[PDB]
Amino acid sequence: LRLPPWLKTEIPMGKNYNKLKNTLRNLNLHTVCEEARCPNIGECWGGGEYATATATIMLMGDTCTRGCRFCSVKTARNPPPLDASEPYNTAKAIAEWGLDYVVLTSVDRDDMPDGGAEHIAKTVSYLKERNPKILVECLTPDFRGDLKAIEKVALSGLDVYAHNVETVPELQSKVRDPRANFDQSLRVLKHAKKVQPDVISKTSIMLGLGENDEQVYATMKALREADVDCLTLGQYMQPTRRHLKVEEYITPEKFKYWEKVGNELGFHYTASGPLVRSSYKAGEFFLKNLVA
């Protein structure tokens, strides 16, 4: 039982924030920020000085078919069916918020035959046809290694294909649902590079789940052997009392250390920090390292 000082946040202020909160409920859309109970809700939904207010619309309802021990998203054996209006409504809300860079995600839908690859592809197609110059990033589930489902999402005009390994291989069974493993998540990023050679790969790992420095180095080196472009490192924080406890709060100085090691291995950009999540300032990192 440890409580750190550099992981404290603020209660959401509603100057530019209720516009996003009321838009999500007008179109009956969900987001991963509210379900996962992220502390960076105020920073991401409301730019302090000059940061475009962004979000992460979570598709296919607020209930996941999987139960990951680090995630507080609701889990049900059979979630409600797909909403056909979700891909169309999402494209409107994103263009309404004036985003030049948007990142989309969704819960796992193991009950769907394609796992929702066609539903995600229609959300990107409606969003790119409406605004061709907007940048889209998809945090894709593993689809249980369905190479056809991964190909369908990667060929939807995607700019950055994102699928997270979450933690080191030795902690896959304790942290993630058994339907997800380390080698499977790598085959999601590898196959996206084969079907779409010009795509940008991106993944996120979490620290504080019992991993050591030796295990983390082998994971990043294996990701570079998978030709993964981008990497994200962040401190795992306990969502609810029912989920896993934090094992070790990584120091911000060591968080900065892995940023140099990522630059050594050749990662196109390594975003590391205690509060750094997958989509945390994703558009800002794109403008600083991926445009030449």
Partner: peptide
Amino acid sequence: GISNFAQEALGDVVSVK
């Protein structure tokens, strides 16, 4: 005390994160 609106978006005091 604490506001219900704040409490529902606060967390679990042990907050938890």
